[PDB]
Structures are given as C-alpha cells and as structure tokens.
Amino acid sequence: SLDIQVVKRGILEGHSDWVTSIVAGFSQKENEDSPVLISGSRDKTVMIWKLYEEEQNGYFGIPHKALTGHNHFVSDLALSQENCFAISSSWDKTLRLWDLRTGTTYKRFVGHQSEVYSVAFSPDNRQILSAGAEREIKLWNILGECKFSSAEKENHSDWVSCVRYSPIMKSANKVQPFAPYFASVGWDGRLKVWNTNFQIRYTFKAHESNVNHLSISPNGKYIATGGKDKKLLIWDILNLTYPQREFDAGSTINQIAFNPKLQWVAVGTDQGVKIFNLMTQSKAPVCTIEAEPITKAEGQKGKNPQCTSLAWNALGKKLFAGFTDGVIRTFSFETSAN
Amino acid sequence: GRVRTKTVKRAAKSLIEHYYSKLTNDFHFNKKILSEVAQVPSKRLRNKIAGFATHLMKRIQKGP
Amino acid sequence: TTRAINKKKKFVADGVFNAELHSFFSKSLQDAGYAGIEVRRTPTKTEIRIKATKPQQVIGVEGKKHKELTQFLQKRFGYSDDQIQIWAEPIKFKGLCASAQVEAMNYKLLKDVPVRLAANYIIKSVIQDGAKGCEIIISGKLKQQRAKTMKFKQGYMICTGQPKNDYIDVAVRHVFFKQGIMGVKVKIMLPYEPNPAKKFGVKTPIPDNVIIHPPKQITDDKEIRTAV
Amino acid sequence: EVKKVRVRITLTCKNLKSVEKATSEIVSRAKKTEQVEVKGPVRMPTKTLVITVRKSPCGEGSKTWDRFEMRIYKRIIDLTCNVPDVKTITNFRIDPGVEIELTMTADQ
Amino acid sequence: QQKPQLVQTFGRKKNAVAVASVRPGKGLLKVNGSPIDMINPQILQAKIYEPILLLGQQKFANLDIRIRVRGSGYTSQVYAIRQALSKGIVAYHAKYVDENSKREIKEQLMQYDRSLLVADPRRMEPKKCGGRGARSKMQKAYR
Amino acid sequence: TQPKLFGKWNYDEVKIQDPCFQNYIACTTTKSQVFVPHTAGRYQVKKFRKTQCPIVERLIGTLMFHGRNAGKKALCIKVVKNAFEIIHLVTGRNPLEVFVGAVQNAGPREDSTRIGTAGVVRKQAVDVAPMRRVNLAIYFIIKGCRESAFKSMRSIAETLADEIINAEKNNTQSSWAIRKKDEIEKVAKGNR
RNA sequence: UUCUUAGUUGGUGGAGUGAUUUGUCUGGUUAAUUCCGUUAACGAACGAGACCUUAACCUGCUAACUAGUCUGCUUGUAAAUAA
Numbered sequence A: 001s002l003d004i005q006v007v008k009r010g011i012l013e014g015h016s017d018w019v020t021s022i023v024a025g026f027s028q029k030e031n032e033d034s035p036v037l038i039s040g041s042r043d044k045t046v047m048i049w050k051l052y053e054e055e056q057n058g059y060f061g062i063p064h065k066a067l068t069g070h071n072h073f074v075s076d077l078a079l080s081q082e083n084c085f086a087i088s089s090s091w092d093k094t095l096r097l098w099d100l101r102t103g104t105t106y107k108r109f110v111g112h113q114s115e116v117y118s119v120a121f122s123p124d125n126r127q128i129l130s131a132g133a134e135r136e137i138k139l140w141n142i143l144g145e146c147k148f149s150s151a152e153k154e155n156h157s158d159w160v161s162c163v164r165y166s167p168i169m170k171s172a173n174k175v176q177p178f179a180p181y182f183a184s185v186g187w188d189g190r191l192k193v194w195n196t197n198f199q200i201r202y203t204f205k206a207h208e209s210n211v212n213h214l215s216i217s218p219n220g221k222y223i224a225t226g227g228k229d230k231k232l233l234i235w236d237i238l239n240l241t242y243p244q245r246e247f248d249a250g251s252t253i254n255q256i257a258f259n260p261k262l263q264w265v266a267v268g269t270d271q272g273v274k275i276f277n278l279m280t281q282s283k284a285p286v287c288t289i290e291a292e293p294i295t296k297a298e299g300q301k302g303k304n305p306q307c308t309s310l311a312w313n314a315l316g317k318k319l320f321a322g323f324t325d326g327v328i329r330t331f332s333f334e335t336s337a338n
Numbered sequence B: 001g002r003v004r005t006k007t008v009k010r011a012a013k014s015l016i017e018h019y020y021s022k023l024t025n026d027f028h029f030n031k032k033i034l035s036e037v038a039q040v041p042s043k044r045l046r047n048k049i050a051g052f053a054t055h056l057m058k059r060i061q062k063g064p
Numbered sequence C: 001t002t003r004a005i006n007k008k009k010k011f012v013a014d015g016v017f018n019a020e021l022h023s024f025f026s027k028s029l030q031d032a033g034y035a036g037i038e039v040r041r042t043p044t045k046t047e048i049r050i051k052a053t054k055p056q057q058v059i060g061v062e063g064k065k066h067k068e069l070t071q072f073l074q075k076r077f078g079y080s081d082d083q084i085q086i087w088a089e090p091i092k093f094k095g096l097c098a099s100a101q102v103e104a105m106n107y108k109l110l111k112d113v114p115v116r117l118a119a120n121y122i123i124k125s126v127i128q129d130g131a132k133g134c135e136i137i138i139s140g141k142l143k144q145q146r147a148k149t150m151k152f153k154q155g156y157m158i159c160t161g162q163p164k165n166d167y168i169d170v171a172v173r174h175v176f177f178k179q180g181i182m183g184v185k186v187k188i189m190l191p192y193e194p195n196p197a198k199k200f201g202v203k204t205p206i207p208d209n210v211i212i213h214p215p216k217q218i219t220d221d222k223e224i225r226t227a228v
Numbered sequence D: 001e002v003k004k005v006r007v008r009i010t011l012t013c014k015n016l017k018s019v020e021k022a023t024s025e026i027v028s029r030a031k032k033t034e035q036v037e038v039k040g041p042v043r044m045p046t047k048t049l050v051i052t053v054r055k056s057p058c059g060e061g062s063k064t065w066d067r068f069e070m071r072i073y074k075r076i077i078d079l080t081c082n083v084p085d086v087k088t089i090t091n092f093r094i095d096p097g098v099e100i101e102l103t104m105t106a107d108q
Numbered sequence E: 001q002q003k004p005q006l007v008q009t010f011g012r013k014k015n016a017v018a019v020a021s022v023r024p025g026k027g028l029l030k031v032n033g034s035p036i037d038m039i040n041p042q043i044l045q046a047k048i049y050e051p052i053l054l055l056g057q058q059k060f061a062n063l064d065i066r067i068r069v070r071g072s073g074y075t076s077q078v079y080a081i082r083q084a085l086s087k088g089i090v091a092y093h094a095k096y097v098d099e100n101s102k103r104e105i106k107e108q109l110m111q112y113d114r115s116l117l118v119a120d121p122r123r124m125e126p127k128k129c130g131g132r133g134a135r136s137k138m139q140k141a142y143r
Numbered sequence F: 001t002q003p004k005l006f007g008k009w010n011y012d013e014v015k016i017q018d019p020c021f022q023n024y025i026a027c028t029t030t031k032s033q034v035f036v037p038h039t040a041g042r043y044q045v046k047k048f049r050k051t052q053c054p055i056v057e058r059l060i061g062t063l064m065f066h067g068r069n070a071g072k073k074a075l076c077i078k079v080v081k082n083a084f085e086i087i088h089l090v091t092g093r094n095p096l097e098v099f100v101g102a103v104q105n106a107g108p109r110e111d112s113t114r115i116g117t118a119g120v121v122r123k124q125a126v127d128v129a130p131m132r133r134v135n136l137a138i139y140f141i142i143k144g145c146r147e148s149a150f151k152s153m154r155s156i157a158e159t160l161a162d163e164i165i166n167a168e169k170n171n172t173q174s175s176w177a178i179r180k181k182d183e184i185e186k187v188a189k190g191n192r
Numbered sequence G: 001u002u003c004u005u006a007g008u009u010g011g012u013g014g015a016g017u018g019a020u021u022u023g024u025c026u027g028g029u030u031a032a033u034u035c036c037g038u039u040a041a042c043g044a045a046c047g048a049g050a051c052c053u054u055a056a057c058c059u060g061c062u063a064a065c066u067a068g069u070c071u072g073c074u075u076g077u078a079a080a081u082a083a
C-alpha cells in the first residue's frame, strides 16, 4: 500500500463564526514558500495571519490584522499577484479592495444589488470578476467601475456560487493549447465556461442539485466541480460529452482545491476533508474528520464541525481547512510507501 | 410563548414541499432561498417561516 | 414671503384648512357622490381636485354649482380669481367608494324602499365592482320606537390590524325621517392591486398572503466538445 | 454673464414618501446637469406634534387617551448654479403636502 | 491633511455618552478636561480605575487618552466613561498593534466585566396613562 | 494585582465551607472581586441571575428601603463601608469574613407552610432552599438594623455592624436575625 | 364595560320528526379555539397571530455650516511641539 498519513500542524483561531474563504501567499521567486495567510468568514471580518515557523503550544500561528469594512458575511477572497492586495466578496452587496500592509480598504465596488458569493482576480490584475444571487457576472476596473454584466441569453438560472479563472503559466514553454476562459458554477447545476469577451463558450449541465464550488488545475487542463450532488466531477476541456472523472465524496461538497503541484484534489465536505489521487483509480486516498476543540469546553459535545473552506500554500506541502467553529486547521503529509 | 402559527407552518410545509433539494441546515441560506422563491410581505414573517422550515429540514434528516 | 409661520403651526393650520374644505364640500355637495378632495398649493394658486362619482352635478348647468362654489371659497378666505382653481375628477370605480355607496342607500331609504332589499342592491353592486367583501350597518329605530341595529355582510372582511386602515374604506351618513335620525355605515374592504397601472384598491398586499412559487422546466441547449 | 449663486432648497412635508420623492429627484436632476454642484439631502430632526385627547365625549368612567401624531419632515438641499439651471431642476410634479422654499446667496 | 495616530471610541449607559480619544504618549486620563480625581461622586471613580488596574498601568503609560462625557446623570455618566475607555484601548491595539493583543485584552476585560465592551440595552420606560408611572396605576375601590 | 474590597479588604481570605452556599454566595469569582459594591447589574432578568451578584451589593440593595430612601444607593454604599470599618475595629479580621460568616450562620433551614392535601389543612414541616436561605438572612439582618436605629442616636452603620457581628456569633439575645431564625426553626420543629 | 379576556360564524358531509347538534374534542401544548394530536367530519371566514409606532445593534453605506470631529494656523495663562 501507499500510505499517505497526516501530521497535525496547528490551529488558527479568533474567527468569530464560520471560515468561508482561505487564501495562501503566491510563490514570489520560484519554488519559495509563502509567508502569507488570509481568511474570510461570516463574522464580518477578513483575517490576516502571522505564521509561527515551528508550532508553539497547539497553535500554528497568530492573528495579525483584522480587516473590518463589512456589514454582512465575507463570502470569498482573492489575492493579487503582488500578494500585497486582497479582495472581499460579501452578502452586503459590495466588494472591497484591501491593502494588505495597512488595514486600509482601497476602493470598494458598489452597484451589485442582491449579494455577492464569489470573486476572481484576472492574471493581468486589471480585471475583477464578481458574482452573486443576481444571476450575474460583473467585470470591474481596479478603479471600481462596472465594465460589463453578462446578460439573460447567456447567464444561468438561480445563483452563481463561484467564478474563477484559467491560469496562463509564465513560460510559453508550459504548453497552453486552449483559449483563455473563465468558469462559472451555479445552483441550476450548470458549469459554464466563457471567453474574455463574455461570450458563452461551453455550458454543460453538470449536476442534479446545486454547485457550491469550482477550481481549475494549475495547468488549466481540467476543472473540478462540486455541491449537494454529493459528487465530485472532473472535466477535460478537450472532451466534454462525458465527464473526465467522477468521485463519490461523502455528503455535501463545500469546497474544492487542486494541489498546485502534487496532482491531488482536496474536497471540503460537511463530514470533513477528503483527498483524491488522480494517479491511481481508487475512491478515498486520505480522509480527515475533525473533532472539536470547542467541544473541549466542559459538557458540550459536538456533532463535529463542517469545513467551510480550503487552501493550499504555494509549495503544496501545507493544507488549510476553514470550519463551522471559526477555527482554521493546518495539516501536513508524510508518505510511507510499502 | 414561542409557539408557531398556522400561516407559518403552512408556509414551511410548502417551502419544503417544492424546494427540498435546494434547502440547507443553515437558516441564513434558507431565508434567502425563501425570499427568492416567494412573496413574503414581512421580514419578520419570512424569518419565522425560514426558521421553522430549517427546523423541519433537521427533523427530516432524522426520519419520517 | 407673507408672514413667517411656525412649521408646526403652519402645518396644523394647513390640515385645518383641508378639513374645513372637506366639511364644506361634503355638506354643500350632498347630491353627487362626493368622495375626496386633494389640495395642491402654489405661491400663485390653490388647486383643489374634488374627487366625485357624479362630476356632472359638481359642475351643474354650465357652472351653476361650480361658479357658486368657486365664489364661495373666494368670499370665505378671500382670494384672487387667479388664486383659486377647482377641478372635478371622476372616480372611475363607484363600487369601490364608500361615501358614494352610503349616499346611494341614503337615497334609496328616503324613498321608503325596504331595508334588506336596498342593502342587498348596494352590496351586490359593490362586489360586482370587484371589492373583496362589504358590510353595511344601519342603526336606530327601524321597526318601532325601540332602537335596533342591523348588520349586512357579504364577501371578505377585516376589522383589526394595520391592514384595516389600508384595505377597509368606511363612510357614515345621518339619514333623516319623520321619526328621527337613523344612521348608516358602509365598510367596503377594497381589493388588492399589485400594479400602479390603475387607481384601484390597495397597492400593498395583506401581510398574510404567503405564496410559494413552484419551479419551471424550460429550453436547455448545452455546449459540448464534438467527438470525431 | 456668469452667475455663481448658492441655492438653498428647504422641503417640509407631513408625508415622508412625498418628500423623499421630491428630494431624490432634485438630487437626481441636479447631478444630471454639469453646471451643478450638490450639497446633498440634509435631514433635519423629525418633528413630532403630539396631541393626547380623552376619548369619551363624557366623563364616562374609564379614562382612555388618544395619542395623535403629526410628523413633519424637513430636508435641505444646496446647489451651486445660475438661475436657469434652478428653474430646470424644479420642473417636476410634486405630491400635494410638500412645501418648497428657495433662497439665493450670491457668490464670487 | 496628515491623518493623525488617533483612535475614537464611544460608550453608553442610559442617556449618557462618552467619546474617548486615544493617541500615543505619556499617559493622561482627562475626562471633560480634568483628571479622574475630580469626577463628581467620589465612590465610583474606582469604577473608572477598574479596567486600568485590570490591564495594568503598563498599557496606559504608553497612551494619552481624553474622554469627553455628556449625558444623563452622574452614575450613567461614570459607566459611559468606563465603556469608552475600555473599548478605546481595544481599538488602538486593533489599528496600531497586532490583532492578537486586541484579542487578549478583549478576553482579559470581558472575563472581569462585559459592561466594558458591551452597552446596557436598558433605557427608561414610557408612562402608561392612569398611573404615576410606567406600570403602577391609579388606586382602585372595589367593594 | 488582586483587588481588595474598598481597597482595604482581601477577598482571598474568604473561604466558604458549607457546600450549599459555595454556588450561592458571590465572592469566589474574578467577577465578584470588586473594589466598589456598585455593579449596575442586570441580576434580575432571569431566575437565578441574582446569585451572580456580589453579596455586598445584595446587602446594599436590601438597605435602600423605605419610601424616603428608595433609590439612594450612594448612601448605602457609605453605610456599608463604614459598618465594615467599625467591624474591623471590633473583631480585627476581614469584615467580609464576618459578613459572609454571618449570612451563612443566620437564616432559616426549616420553615412551616400550609400544604393542602385533600382534607388536610394544618401547618407542615418544610425545608428552606439555599437561595431563600441567603435572601432571608440579609432581609432579617437589615430589618433588625432599621428597627433598632430608628429613633436612636446609633447610626445605621453602627446598628448594622452590631448586627453582623452578633449574627456570626450566633447570639440569640443580641442578634435580631438569629432571634427570628430560632423562632422560625422552633415554629417548624413544633409543626412536624 | 364585560375584555385585550379568546372568543364567534357559515358551506358540504354525519346525527335528531324537531328546536338543535357535530365541526368548535379526551389529552398534551401556547400569552391565544396557539398549535399538535384525537377525530363523522372535510375544508374555510372573522377575532389571536400576521400588521403598524416608538426604544435597543451597525467604527459598513448615503450625507450634513441649521450637527460634530480632526488638520493647519493662531490667542490666553505657562520654560513651553506640556496642560
């Protein structure tokens, strides 16, 4: 057997409610580690984390700056390439541009109506993409002006849950055969793929229930898609009649994340976090349920927390899961191969 | 005095009846779901309906 | 400016003006169904819209009642002839106006037409015009020297709540007989009208109505990579 | 012949809806014109006239009281303009219970 | 305009309001432009000294804090001052220090008293007719 | 630094023994060590919240009574601190240890009540809860205070101090609180 | 004023020659004929609820010389980038 076992790293706490979004630093000079962690939660707060080198006590790190601009929950965060800037989606019908050194909000994006579930940052950093319960995807100048809004003929029924982008690697030698696209996942169970011009390129009806999250392989060759459908769908951008691969992950799918290198898929689920190996065909490579540190409070027992977010650090060695109890948990992997 | 009324329980029944596949254990989700799905004249009302419907989602998860 | 007046004292004075008008018009206009009065106030002018069922009697025979009225307001307050303007506006649905209908049964009861029949006639009219529900109360000596109170309901009726003030329209009249004053109330609960498109009913629904709206199945074409 | 004139619009109304209609289309209309600078809606404190009245026209024994309110909403809007622009921005229909007062301070 | 190093917090009990402004330096506490020493009923000065002693003077020697209080009557006023001060330090440690310190002073304070960071929701009750007060009513004769 | 009550009295020296009272008398907690007896607390919104109120504040509450004194708290804070001073001048130990001692030591355990069962109506022998035991203790102590100090020259601080000391000492002559306590417990024993 | 108590009707079915009755109840439960359940009753209307006004939360939004804050100038008492 190839055993992939998990060593517990630590605990990042002080998020009052849920942990809805997590982003880790971009690798700046190549193959070097990311010092930076940012989370977003219900709690009305964006947390900036200063990380311990080793682990002291049971903790992996300590809260550095708490960004407060927001009325309702923070749905999703995204980083600039600079790593010096972050952005916040919210149910408060607004987006925010955050300087990461100062607590300062730079500009805020207004003009969304209902509420905002996700945001994406384009590789050029001059385009912001935002989506919400308006069944609408919006394109913003970094100066805070709505540039475009996808219309009825294209846009999908119910709510856009998540929008993301299609990485173009640095070297041209990294083999980019396709066109640039952006992907939109929804509560109608539709995975959409649009060109830069906001023209529908490929819209497949992926799921039977609703889709909470979508992420793209670092290669931009495949898409991972998931929600209440209790199914993890992997799609080849070459042949779409049939989904590339499918996995059964217990109960409901909250988040999905590709290992920036390692070629695994980590899935945030109510039961816990599952990790899939794409290199072999088997259905459950590493499974983590987490008992509650808040349960250690005397007399109160948990049903377990459910994990509301995932992120990998740039090196792909560390993994962060945001939870129901407002605690981020950190885990590392040791390989024992028989 | 927290007993819930006719209007609210009829409402909750209906909301689950048509929408069960869309509905979550989270109140805050279900209240927005309701808002989109229905005509509810009050904030207060909608919230009561959503709360009871949530309650019933949890009761459904357990059995009949 | 004329005089600097207390925003409070001015506004109360404006309301008292309005009420004096309403008493004046309900009193002197008693034959054509009179409903309401709407007053716009310009530094130049004062515009009065008399909302009524039978505008034709507000005007009269080539402005006999109109000119009379206009001049009455003139002598009463003092006004320039350019300063006063009276319009009469029709109420498109007579069945949704109470004061009107109570004037109707005032009339019918003067002609000795029996109670239940008259009440029924108007009620049937009111619901014919689309009102959800109506009620009429007649009080006083009917039968004999000992006072009676008779209620007539049909359709849907609310009494209590803020919705009362919205959906329910009420008017009373004193009716005169050789025997004394008898009196008559009409409560028309109005219907619910969701669009500004018409002057009808109530723009904001009863807080009770909870309507769930079941999902649809529509045209779906996907976009898929071809296989060769 | 350039005129820089600061215009003071005071709106008073017993109904709120009416006054916010007035306010917000004045702000909308003023912004729509280029010669114009708008110091926005200024909301005065809300004036509540209360009259507490005994119900029964008689001494009939239980004392009941009626709390009779009239609210007066007062708004202020400020403009930087010339005469014709003012008369452009005042050009729209307004609900009856509205008082509109205009004052002009010259500015150099 | 040169944005100052200022932090401004408010605090509340009944009709009383305290605005405390916090800036770095040699620590003063001046309430309405005067030392705590002179606050009117002497007894509850210790109420204001409470969060100070709880956190230790070491946090307060680094900061000049000036609290202006206008409000209802003596006691509520004292409570407002308390509040504004307390959450004032917290806001400082939020902007100018690490978040961690904000957290641990928050916990530190609230374990002692929650009235420091959270306001008393109570306000007066209006009077129901037929009584000398907001519940009690005109005496009744049954027999 | 551990706050001392009024600044001169250390809470750390007060230890409660009888296992009924430890949950019912405040001073054990970080939250109950207060320089000033004045919390402006919400102690009455729920059934047992009164427990979490500092005992000296409780006493102060009981003191505030009669139409003329209603709602003058400062007066009673004074009275209490003074009485506590006179206490340390007499005994010489923590006026708190004396107070707490005297709340514990004086209040009823048995009390008699009418329990209707079918035809039976007559007094019956009933046991007193911890919370009521405490409440009553304070009620009594202070009522004795008032009755005595009324037209005399002795002030309330004095009367109250006298009472607190006698109350811990168990004195059935000098302590009104214990006069009533014993009287009640006797009524009760007789009614079994 | 009963009484702010929680009451009151009708349609179609069931029972009485009939006035009438069931519905509108043993029992839980609620502040509430509020609900649950029982159920020759099934569904509904009024009343209660829903509603509306005031008070309590927003270091987020929209703004304010008929609110305040700060910033920079100054003035007074002071050795005064103190107060």
Ligand SMILES: [Mg+2]
Binding pocket: E132
């Ligand atoms: Mg008095």
Ligand SMILES: [Mg+2]
Binding pocket: none
């Ligand atoms: Mg029948």
Ligand SMILES: [Mg+2]
Binding pocket: none
């Ligand atoms: Mg029958």
Ligand SMILES: [Mg+2]
Binding pocket: none
């Ligand atoms: Mg029969």
Ligand SMILES: [Mg+2]
Binding pocket: G024
């Ligand atoms: Mg009956």
Ligand SMILES: [Mg+2]
Binding pocket: none
């Ligand atoms: Mg029924």
